[PDB]
Write a protein that binds this ligand. Structure first.
Ligand SMILES: *[C@@H]1O[C@H](CO)[C@@H](O)[C@H](O)[C@H]1NC(C)=O
Ligand SMILES: [Cl-]
Ligand SMILES: [Cl-]
Ligand SMILES: [Cl-]
Ligand SMILES: [Cl-]
Length: 498
Protein backbone atom coordinates (compact mmCIF):
# COMPACT_ATOMS: atom_id res chain seq x y z
CA UNK A 1 0.00 0.00 0.00
CA UNK A 2 1.07 3.61 -0.82
CA UNK A 3 0.90 6.24 2.02
CA UNK A 4 -2.12 8.64 1.56
CA UNK A 5 -0.17 11.73 2.77
CA UNK A 6 3.04 10.79 0.90
CA UNK A 7 1.56 9.74 -2.47
CA UNK A 8 -2.14 10.73 -2.54
CA UNK A 9 -1.64 14.25 -1.18
CA UNK A 10 2.05 14.58 -2.34
CA UNK A 11 2.63 15.87 1.21
CA UNK A 12 4.60 15.06 4.38
CA UNK A 13 3.53 14.18 7.94
CA UNK A 14 4.14 16.99 10.47
CA UNK A 15 5.69 16.45 13.95
CA UNK A 16 7.00 19.66 15.58
CA UNK A 17 6.54 18.81 19.30
CA UNK A 18 10.33 18.21 19.53
CA UNK A 19 10.85 21.99 19.23
CA UNK A 20 8.45 22.59 22.18
CA UNK A 21 9.00 19.72 24.68
CA UNK A 22 10.68 16.30 25.21
CA UNK A 23 9.37 14.24 22.25
CA UNK A 24 8.99 10.46 21.76
CA UNK A 25 11.50 9.42 19.08
CA UNK A 26 10.64 6.49 16.73
CA UNK A 27 12.88 3.61 17.93
CA UNK A 28 15.35 1.73 15.69
CA UNK A 29 13.65 -0.93 13.50
CA UNK A 30 16.56 -2.56 11.63
CA UNK A 31 15.78 -5.74 9.62
CA UNK A 32 16.43 -9.04 11.44
CA UNK A 33 19.12 -11.64 10.70
CA UNK A 34 18.09 -14.95 9.10
CA UNK A 35 16.20 -13.30 6.24
CA UNK A 36 16.30 -14.34 2.54
CA UNK A 37 18.73 -12.35 0.32
CA UNK A 38 15.90 -10.37 -1.45
CA UNK A 39 13.84 -9.79 1.78
CA UNK A 40 16.88 -8.22 3.57
CA UNK A 41 17.52 -5.87 0.60
CA UNK A 42 13.76 -5.01 0.64
CA UNK A 43 13.56 -4.54 4.45
CA UNK A 44 16.82 -2.45 4.52
CA UNK A 45 15.20 -0.21 1.82
CA UNK A 46 11.92 -0.08 3.81
CA UNK A 47 13.81 0.67 7.11
CA UNK A 48 15.71 3.56 5.39
CA UNK A 49 12.51 4.86 3.64
CA UNK A 50 10.58 4.94 6.95
CA UNK A 51 13.57 6.53 8.77
CA UNK A 52 13.88 9.22 6.02
CA UNK A 53 10.11 9.87 6.27
CA UNK A 54 10.04 10.13 10.15
CA UNK A 55 13.23 12.33 10.12
CA UNK A 56 11.58 14.55 7.46
CA UNK A 57 8.18 14.58 9.26
CA UNK A 58 9.84 15.91 12.41
CA UNK A 59 13.19 17.64 11.68
CA UNK A 60 14.34 17.72 7.98
CA UNK A 61 11.09 19.08 6.38
CA UNK A 62 10.50 21.71 9.12
CA UNK A 63 13.59 23.99 9.27
CA UNK A 64 11.41 27.15 9.16
CA UNK A 65 9.71 26.50 12.57
CA UNK A 66 12.95 27.63 14.38
CA UNK A 67 11.67 31.28 14.26
CA UNK A 68 8.98 29.90 16.60
CA UNK A 69 11.70 28.32 18.78
CA UNK A 70 13.26 31.84 19.09
CA UNK A 71 9.77 33.23 20.04
CA UNK A 72 9.13 30.41 22.58
CA UNK A 73 12.65 30.85 24.13
CA UNK A 74 11.97 34.60 24.60
CA UNK A 75 8.50 34.00 26.23
CA UNK A 76 10.06 31.72 28.96
CA UNK A 77 13.17 33.93 29.35
CA UNK A 78 11.15 37.20 29.69
CA UNK A 79 8.62 35.60 32.17
CA UNK A 80 11.50 34.34 34.43
CA UNK A 81 13.22 37.77 34.11
CA UNK A 82 9.91 39.52 35.10
CA UNK A 83 9.56 37.19 38.19
CA UNK A 84 13.06 38.15 39.47
CA UNK A 85 12.36 41.81 38.56
CA UNK A 86 9.03 41.90 40.50
CA UNK A 87 10.93 40.40 43.49
CA UNK A 88 13.48 43.27 43.37
CA UNK A 89 16.50 41.12 42.37
CA UNK A 90 19.85 42.42 41.00
CA UNK A 91 20.22 42.81 37.18
CA UNK A 92 22.70 39.84 37.29
CA UNK A 93 20.07 37.54 38.96
CA UNK A 94 17.32 38.76 36.50
CA UNK A 95 19.53 37.94 33.46
CA UNK A 96 20.76 34.59 34.98
CA UNK A 97 17.11 33.47 35.49
CA UNK A 98 16.29 34.50 31.90
CA UNK A 99 19.39 32.74 30.35
CA UNK A 100 18.73 29.51 32.38
CA UNK A 101 15.25 29.36 30.76
CA UNK A 102 16.84 29.92 27.28
CA UNK A 103 19.46 27.20 27.94
CA UNK A 104 16.95 24.77 29.59
CA UNK A 105 14.43 25.03 26.72
CA UNK A 106 17.08 25.01 23.91
CA UNK A 107 18.74 21.92 25.54
CA UNK A 108 15.36 20.09 25.17
CA UNK A 109 15.24 21.22 21.48
CA UNK A 110 18.93 20.28 20.78
CA UNK A 111 18.52 16.91 22.59
CA UNK A 112 15.38 15.98 20.59
CA UNK A 113 17.12 16.93 17.30
CA UNK A 114 20.29 14.94 18.15
CA UNK A 115 18.36 11.90 19.55
CA UNK A 116 16.50 11.71 16.17
CA UNK A 117 19.95 11.59 14.42
CA UNK A 118 21.32 9.12 17.06
CA UNK A 119 18.37 6.69 16.52
CA UNK A 120 19.04 6.85 12.75
CA UNK A 121 22.83 6.10 13.15
CA UNK A 122 22.07 3.33 15.77
CA UNK A 123 19.54 1.74 13.34
CA UNK A 124 22.09 2.09 10.48
CA UNK A 125 24.71 0.31 12.67
CA UNK A 126 22.31 -2.65 13.21
CA UNK A 127 21.53 -2.61 9.41
CA UNK A 128 25.30 -2.81 8.60
CA UNK A 129 25.55 -5.66 11.21
CA UNK A 130 22.66 -7.64 9.61
CA UNK A 131 24.12 -6.96 6.09
CA UNK A 132 27.75 -8.07 6.94
CA UNK A 133 26.41 -11.12 8.93
CA UNK A 134 24.16 -12.17 5.96
CA UNK A 135 26.04 -14.93 4.07
CA UNK A 136 24.85 -13.95 0.56
CA UNK A 137 24.98 -10.13 0.83
CA UNK A 138 27.57 -7.38 1.41
CA UNK A 139 27.21 -3.60 1.93
CA UNK A 140 27.59 -2.97 -1.84
CA UNK A 141 24.42 -5.01 -2.63
CA UNK A 142 22.16 -2.65 -0.59
CA UNK A 143 24.25 0.64 -0.57
CA UNK A 144 25.62 2.70 -3.54
CA UNK A 145 29.07 2.88 -1.77
CA UNK A 146 30.21 5.68 -4.11
CA UNK A 147 31.84 9.07 -3.46
CA UNK A 148 31.92 12.35 -5.48
CA UNK A 149 34.53 10.87 -7.92
CA UNK A 150 32.03 7.94 -8.61
CA UNK A 151 34.69 5.68 -6.98
CA UNK A 152 33.92 2.88 -4.50
CA UNK A 153 34.45 3.94 -0.84
CA UNK A 154 36.60 1.58 1.34
CA UNK A 155 33.73 1.11 3.89
CA UNK A 156 30.49 2.68 5.18
CA UNK A 157 30.30 2.56 9.00
CA UNK A 158 27.97 3.87 11.75
CA UNK A 159 29.25 4.78 15.23
CA UNK A 160 26.24 5.11 17.62
CA UNK A 161 26.22 7.58 20.58
CA UNK A 162 28.61 6.30 23.25
CA UNK A 163 31.06 4.76 20.69
CA UNK A 164 34.70 5.98 20.54
CA UNK A 165 34.05 7.49 17.06
CA UNK A 166 30.85 9.35 18.19
CA UNK A 167 31.22 13.16 18.65
CA UNK A 168 30.59 14.91 22.01
CA UNK A 169 28.27 17.94 21.83
CA UNK A 170 27.93 20.54 24.59
CA UNK A 171 24.25 21.50 25.10
CA UNK A 172 23.01 25.04 26.02
CA UNK A 173 22.56 23.66 29.59
CA UNK A 174 26.33 23.08 29.62
CA UNK A 175 25.84 19.28 29.85
CA UNK A 176 27.47 16.93 27.27
CA UNK A 177 25.68 14.56 24.84
CA UNK A 178 27.24 11.89 22.59
CA UNK A 179 26.09 12.17 18.93
CA UNK A 180 26.27 9.25 16.49
CA UNK A 181 28.46 9.55 13.38
CA UNK A 182 28.20 8.28 9.79
CA UNK A 183 31.76 7.09 8.94
CA UNK A 184 33.34 6.89 5.45
CA UNK A 185 36.49 4.70 5.61
CA UNK A 186 39.34 6.10 3.43
CA UNK A 187 41.98 3.75 4.90
CA UNK A 188 44.00 5.41 7.73
CA UNK A 189 41.94 8.63 7.19
CA UNK A 190 38.11 8.59 7.68
CA UNK A 191 35.16 11.00 7.25
CA UNK A 192 32.71 11.43 10.13
CA UNK A 193 29.25 12.98 9.62
CA UNK A 194 26.97 14.43 12.29
CA UNK A 195 24.40 17.36 12.25
CA UNK A 196 27.08 19.76 13.67
CA UNK A 197 30.00 19.07 11.27
CA UNK A 198 27.92 18.20 8.18
CA UNK A 199 29.83 16.98 5.11
CA UNK A 200 33.62 17.48 4.65
CA UNK A 201 33.04 19.33 1.32
CA UNK A 202 35.47 17.47 -1.04
CA UNK A 203 34.93 14.57 -3.55
CA UNK A 204 35.80 11.98 -0.84
CA UNK A 205 32.31 12.41 0.70
CA UNK A 206 29.41 9.99 -0.06
CA UNK A 207 28.19 10.83 -3.62
CA UNK A 208 24.87 12.15 -2.24
CA UNK A 209 26.03 13.16 1.26
CA UNK A 210 24.27 10.44 3.21
CA UNK A 211 24.08 6.68 2.49
CA UNK A 212 22.20 5.73 -0.69
CA UNK A 213 19.99 2.68 -0.07
CA UNK A 214 19.02 0.83 -3.26
CA UNK A 215 16.52 -2.01 -3.99
CA UNK A 216 14.88 -3.26 -7.26
CA UNK A 217 15.98 -0.21 -9.33
CA UNK A 218 14.63 2.28 -6.73
CA UNK A 219 17.03 4.09 -4.43
CA UNK A 220 16.99 6.79 -1.72
CA UNK A 221 19.31 9.12 0.21
CA UNK A 222 18.84 9.54 3.98
CA UNK A 223 21.10 10.47 6.96
CA UNK A 224 22.45 13.32 4.74
CA UNK A 225 24.41 15.62 7.13
CA UNK A 226 24.04 18.41 4.44
CA UNK A 227 20.28 18.49 5.30
CA UNK A 228 20.87 18.49 9.11
CA UNK A 229 23.73 21.10 9.16
CA UNK A 230 21.48 24.10 8.07
CA UNK A 231 18.90 23.16 10.80
CA UNK A 232 21.69 22.86 13.48
CA UNK A 233 23.33 26.20 12.36
CA UNK A 234 19.96 28.06 12.45
CA UNK A 235 19.21 26.46 15.88
CA UNK A 236 22.71 27.57 17.05
CA UNK A 237 22.05 31.09 15.62
CA UNK A 238 18.73 31.19 17.61
CA UNK A 239 20.53 30.17 20.88
CA UNK A 240 23.21 32.89 20.40
CA UNK A 241 20.67 35.59 19.32
CA UNK A 242 18.22 34.91 22.22
CA UNK A 243 21.17 34.95 24.77
CA UNK A 244 22.55 38.29 23.41
CA UNK A 245 19.01 39.63 22.90
CA UNK A 246 17.75 38.79 26.42
CA UNK A 247 20.98 40.42 27.84
CA UNK A 248 19.94 43.56 25.87
CA UNK A 249 16.23 43.13 26.89
CA UNK A 250 17.16 42.92 30.64
CA UNK A 251 19.40 46.07 30.32
CA UNK A 252 16.55 48.05 28.63
CA UNK A 253 13.83 46.87 31.11
CA UNK A 254 15.80 46.93 34.46
CA UNK A 255 14.90 50.11 36.35
CA UNK A 256 12.44 51.29 33.64
CA UNK A 257 9.86 48.52 34.31
CA UNK A 258 8.80 48.71 37.99
CA UNK A 259 7.87 45.74 40.25
CA UNK A 260 4.17 45.03 39.69
CA UNK A 261 4.06 46.77 36.25
CA UNK A 262 3.90 43.34 34.49
CA UNK A 263 2.24 40.29 36.15
CA UNK A 264 2.85 37.08 34.13
CA UNK A 265 3.02 34.49 36.99
CA UNK A 266 -0.66 33.47 36.38
CA UNK A 267 -0.09 33.31 32.55
CA UNK A 268 -0.09 29.85 30.86
CA UNK A 269 2.45 30.00 27.96
CA UNK A 270 1.50 28.79 24.40
CA UNK A 271 4.25 26.12 24.94
CA UNK A 272 2.70 25.01 28.32
CA UNK A 273 -0.86 24.85 26.79
CA UNK A 274 0.46 22.63 23.89
CA UNK A 275 2.36 20.41 26.44
CA UNK A 276 -0.89 20.01 28.45
CA UNK A 277 -2.87 19.09 25.27
CA UNK A 278 -0.11 16.52 24.46
CA UNK A 279 -0.86 14.81 27.83
CA UNK A 280 -4.62 14.45 26.98
CA UNK A 281 -7.02 13.55 24.09
CA UNK A 282 -8.63 16.31 22.00
CA UNK A 283 -7.54 18.27 18.93
CA UNK A 284 -4.73 17.09 16.58
CA UNK A 285 -1.36 17.88 18.27
CA UNK A 286 0.71 19.18 15.28
CA UNK A 287 -1.60 22.24 14.78
CA UNK A 288 -1.67 22.80 18.62
CA UNK A 289 2.18 22.75 18.50
CA UNK A 290 2.27 24.96 15.32
CA UNK A 291 0.06 27.60 17.11
CA UNK A 292 2.41 27.36 20.17
CA UNK A 293 5.40 27.92 17.79
CA UNK A 294 3.55 31.10 16.60
CA UNK A 295 3.39 30.03 12.92
CA UNK A 296 0.94 32.35 10.99
CA UNK A 297 -2.39 30.45 10.67
CA UNK A 298 -5.81 30.92 9.01
CA UNK A 299 -8.12 29.13 11.46
CA UNK A 300 -11.24 31.02 10.21
CA UNK A 301 -11.16 30.05 6.49
CA UNK A 302 -11.77 26.42 5.46
CA UNK A 303 -10.34 25.68 2.02
CA UNK A 304 -11.02 22.70 -0.25
CA UNK A 305 -7.81 21.92 -2.22
CA UNK A 306 -7.05 19.67 -5.22
CA UNK A 307 -3.55 18.14 -5.35
CA UNK A 308 -2.82 18.67 -9.08
CA UNK A 309 -0.62 15.53 -9.60
CA UNK A 310 -3.20 13.02 -8.15
CA UNK A 311 -6.59 14.83 -8.19
CA UNK A 312 -7.11 14.26 -4.42
CA UNK A 313 -9.65 16.71 -2.86
CA UNK A 314 -9.23 17.63 0.84
CA UNK A 315 -11.02 20.29 3.02
CA UNK A 316 -8.93 22.09 5.66
CA UNK A 317 -7.20 25.14 7.16
CA UNK A 318 -3.82 26.66 6.17
CA UNK A 319 -0.70 27.53 8.16
CA UNK A 320 2.21 29.44 6.63
CA UNK A 321 5.72 29.72 8.11
CA UNK A 322 6.13 32.84 5.92
CA UNK A 323 2.80 34.71 5.35
CA UNK A 324 4.74 36.51 2.48
CA UNK A 325 3.80 33.49 0.32
CA UNK A 326 0.22 34.42 1.19
CA UNK A 327 -2.50 35.52 1.00
CA UNK A 328 -3.62 32.32 -0.76
CA UNK A 329 -6.60 32.96 -3.08
CA UNK A 330 -9.68 30.95 -4.23
CA UNK A 331 -9.44 29.40 -7.73
CA UNK A 332 -5.63 29.78 -7.84
CA UNK A 333 -2.94 27.10 -8.25
CA UNK A 334 0.04 27.22 -5.86
CA UNK A 335 3.46 25.64 -6.10
CA UNK A 336 4.86 25.22 -2.57
CA UNK A 337 8.37 24.69 -4.03
CA UNK A 338 8.42 28.40 -5.14
CA UNK A 339 7.37 29.52 -1.62
CA UNK A 340 9.99 31.17 0.65
CA UNK A 341 8.61 29.25 3.66
CA UNK A 342 6.72 25.99 4.32
CA UNK A 343 2.98 25.32 3.78
CA UNK A 344 1.01 23.37 6.41
CA UNK A 345 -2.56 22.00 6.04
CA UNK A 346 -4.72 20.82 8.98
CA UNK A 347 -7.49 18.58 7.62
CA UNK A 348 -9.73 15.64 8.49
CA UNK A 349 -8.09 12.78 6.50
CA UNK A 350 -11.44 10.92 6.78
CA UNK A 351 -12.80 13.46 4.21
CA UNK A 352 -10.16 12.73 1.46
CA UNK A 353 -11.87 12.18 -1.96
CA UNK A 354 -10.74 11.89 -5.58
CA UNK A 355 -11.45 10.35 -8.97
CA UNK A 356 -9.55 7.09 -9.62
CA UNK A 357 -8.33 6.59 -13.23
CA UNK A 358 -5.57 4.02 -12.53
CA UNK A 359 -7.73 0.97 -13.42
CA UNK A 360 -8.20 -1.57 -16.24
CA UNK A 361 -11.59 -1.29 -18.02
CA UNK A 362 -12.04 -5.09 -18.42
CA UNK A 363 -13.39 -7.11 -15.44
CA UNK A 364 -12.07 -10.68 -16.00
CA UNK A 365 -14.62 -12.88 -14.14
CA UNK A 366 -14.94 -10.57 -11.13
CA UNK A 367 -11.17 -9.82 -10.99
CA UNK A 368 -10.91 -5.98 -11.14
CA UNK A 369 -7.36 -4.70 -11.86
CA UNK A 370 -5.72 -1.38 -10.73
CA UNK A 371 -2.66 0.06 -12.52
CA UNK A 372 -1.54 2.11 -9.42
CA UNK A 373 -1.14 1.28 -5.69
CA UNK A 374 -4.26 2.24 -3.64
CA UNK A 375 -3.72 4.74 -0.80
CA UNK A 376 -3.52 3.78 2.92
CA UNK A 377 -6.70 4.21 4.96
CA UNK A 378 -8.73 4.58 1.71
CA UNK A 379 -10.93 2.32 -0.50
CA UNK A 380 -11.38 2.29 -4.30
CA UNK A 381 -15.13 2.55 -5.13
CA UNK A 382 -15.69 1.17 -8.63
CA UNK A 383 -18.82 1.77 -10.74
CA UNK A 384 -19.46 -1.08 -13.21
CA UNK A 385 -21.16 -0.71 -16.69
CA UNK A 386 -24.30 -2.45 -15.23
CA UNK A 387 -24.45 0.46 -12.63
CA UNK A 388 -23.07 -1.73 -9.77
CA UNK A 389 -21.03 0.16 -7.14
CA UNK A 390 -18.45 -1.74 -4.99
CA UNK A 391 -15.80 -0.34 -2.56
CA UNK A 392 -12.60 -2.36 -1.82
CA UNK A 393 -10.16 -1.39 1.00
CA UNK A 394 -6.43 -0.80 0.19
CA UNK A 395 -5.32 -3.89 2.18
CA UNK A 396 -7.77 -6.14 0.30
CA UNK A 397 -6.08 -5.33 -3.06
CA UNK A 398 -3.54 -8.04 -4.02
CA UNK A 399 -0.29 -7.06 -5.72
CA UNK A 400 1.60 -8.82 -8.52
CA UNK A 401 5.28 -8.24 -9.40
CA UNK A 402 4.28 -6.49 -12.68
CA UNK A 403 2.77 -3.39 -10.93
CA UNK A 404 -0.96 -4.28 -10.92
CA UNK A 405 -3.50 -4.68 -8.08
CA UNK A 406 -6.30 -7.26 -8.36
CA UNK A 407 -9.30 -8.21 -6.18
CA UNK A 408 -12.04 -10.81 -6.80
CA UNK A 409 -15.25 -8.71 -6.70
CA UNK A 410 -17.40 -11.66 -7.98
CA UNK A 411 -19.10 -12.38 -4.53
CA UNK A 412 -20.33 -8.74 -4.27
CA UNK A 413 -21.29 -8.59 -8.00
CA UNK A 414 -24.23 -10.04 -10.03
CA UNK A 415 -22.51 -9.37 -13.41
CA UNK A 416 -18.89 -10.53 -12.83
CA UNK A 417 -17.94 -10.00 -16.51
CA UNK A 418 -18.26 -6.21 -17.10
CA UNK A 419 -16.34 -2.94 -17.89
CA UNK A 420 -15.45 -0.29 -15.23
CA UNK A 421 -16.88 3.07 -16.42
CA UNK A 422 -16.14 5.16 -13.28
CA UNK A 423 -13.89 4.86 -10.17
CA UNK A 424 -13.08 7.04 -7.11
CA UNK A 425 -11.24 6.73 -3.76
CA UNK A 426 -12.56 7.63 -0.28
CA UNK A 427 -11.46 7.04 3.36
CA UNK A 428 -12.08 3.72 5.22
CA UNK A 429 -12.14 5.56 8.63
CA UNK A 430 -15.47 5.90 10.51
CA UNK A 431 -14.07 8.41 13.09
CA UNK A 432 -12.49 11.83 12.34
CA UNK A 433 -8.77 11.74 11.43
CA UNK A 434 -7.66 15.38 11.83
CA UNK A 435 -3.94 15.77 10.94
CA UNK A 436 -1.42 18.44 9.85
CA UNK A 437 0.44 17.77 6.58
CA UNK A 438 3.18 19.79 4.83
CA UNK A 439 2.21 20.54 1.20
CA UNK A 440 5.16 19.78 -1.14
CA UNK A 441 3.37 19.28 -4.46
CA UNK A 442 1.18 21.72 -6.40
CA UNK A 443 -2.48 22.23 -5.41
CA UNK A 444 -5.47 24.38 -6.42
CA UNK A 445 -7.90 26.05 -3.97
CA UNK A 446 -11.29 25.04 -5.47
CA UNK A 447 -13.17 27.00 -2.74
CA UNK A 448 -12.60 29.21 0.38
CA UNK A 449 -15.27 29.43 3.14
CA UNK A 450 -15.37 31.54 6.33
CA UNK A 451 -16.38 28.93 8.98
CA UNK A 452 -18.18 31.47 11.30
CA UNK A 453 -20.27 33.50 8.75
CA UNK A 454 -20.51 30.55 6.31
CA UNK A 455 -19.79 32.81 3.30
CA UNK A 456 -17.60 31.96 0.26
CA UNK A 457 -14.60 34.35 0.45
CA UNK A 458 -11.86 34.92 -2.23
CA UNK A 459 -8.70 35.33 -0.05
CA UNK A 460 -6.98 34.02 3.13
CA UNK A 461 -5.86 36.01 6.25
CA UNK A 462 -2.98 34.62 8.36
CA UNK A 463 -2.79 35.47 12.09
CA UNK A 464 0.10 35.24 14.56
CA UNK A 465 1.09 36.99 17.80
CA UNK A 466 3.73 39.76 17.67
CA UNK A 467 7.16 38.02 17.58
CA UNK A 468 9.62 38.73 20.42
CA UNK A 469 12.57 41.15 20.14
CA UNK A 470 14.97 42.61 22.72
CA UNK A 471 12.78 45.75 23.10
CA UNK A 472 9.20 44.27 23.03
CA UNK A 473 6.78 42.62 25.62
CA UNK A 474 7.56 45.35 28.19
CA UNK A 475 3.82 46.14 28.78
CA UNK A 476 0.93 44.15 30.36
CA UNK A 477 -1.32 44.72 27.25
CA UNK A 478 1.32 42.96 25.02
CA UNK A 479 1.47 39.90 27.37
CA UNK A 480 -2.37 39.75 27.83
CA UNK A 481 -2.78 39.89 23.99
CA UNK A 482 -0.23 37.01 23.57
CA UNK A 483 -2.29 34.93 26.09
CA UNK A 484 -5.66 35.87 24.48
CA UNK A 485 -4.57 35.35 20.79
CA UNK A 486 -3.28 31.86 21.74
CA UNK A 487 -6.47 30.97 23.72
CA UNK A 488 -8.81 32.06 20.84
CA UNK A 489 -6.75 30.16 18.20
CA UNK A 490 -6.85 26.95 20.30
CA UNK A 491 -10.65 27.33 20.96
CA UNK A 492 -11.19 27.92 17.16
CA UNK A 493 -9.50 24.57 16.29
CA UNK A 494 -11.14 22.76 19.27
CA UNK A 495 -14.58 23.91 17.98
CA UNK A 496 -13.87 22.84 14.34
CA UNK A 497 -12.47 19.39 15.40
CA UNK A 498 -15.67 18.37 17.33
C1 LIG B 1 -10.82 -6.47 4.03
O1 LIG B 1 -11.75 -7.56 3.97
C2 LIG B 1 -12.24 -7.95 5.26
C3 LIG B 1 -13.08 -9.19 5.06
O2 LIG B 1 -12.27 -10.30 4.67
C4 LIG B 1 -13.00 -6.78 5.88
O3 LIG B 1 -13.62 -7.17 7.10
C5 LIG B 1 -12.05 -5.62 6.13
O4 LIG B 1 -12.80 -4.47 6.52
C6 LIG B 1 -11.25 -5.28 4.87
N1 LIG B 1 -10.13 -4.38 5.20
C7 LIG B 1 -8.83 -4.53 4.82
C8 LIG B 1 -7.98 -3.29 4.88
O5 LIG B 1 -8.35 -5.60 4.46
CL1 LIG C 1 26.28 4.61 0.15
CL1 LIG D 1 17.25 11.50 7.24
CL1 LIG E 1 27.38 20.19 4.76
CL1 LIG F 1 -1.33 15.65 14.05
Amino acid sequence: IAPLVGVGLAAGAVGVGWALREFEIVGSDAPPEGLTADALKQQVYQTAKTRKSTNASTIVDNQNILDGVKHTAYTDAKIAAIEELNAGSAESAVLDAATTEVNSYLTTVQSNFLKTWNESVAELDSILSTVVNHPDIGKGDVFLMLNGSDNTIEDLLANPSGSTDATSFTLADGTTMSVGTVEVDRGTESYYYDPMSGLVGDLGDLKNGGPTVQYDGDSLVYLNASNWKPIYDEMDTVLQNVRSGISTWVSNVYGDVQSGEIEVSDLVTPRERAAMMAQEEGMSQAIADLIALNVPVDAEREATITIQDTGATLPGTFALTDASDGPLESGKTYDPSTFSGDVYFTADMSLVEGDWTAYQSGVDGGNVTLTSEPYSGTAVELNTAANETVAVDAGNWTATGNGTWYHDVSPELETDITSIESARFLSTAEQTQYETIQLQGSFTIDKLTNTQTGEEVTATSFDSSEPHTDSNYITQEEWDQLEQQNKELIEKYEQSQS
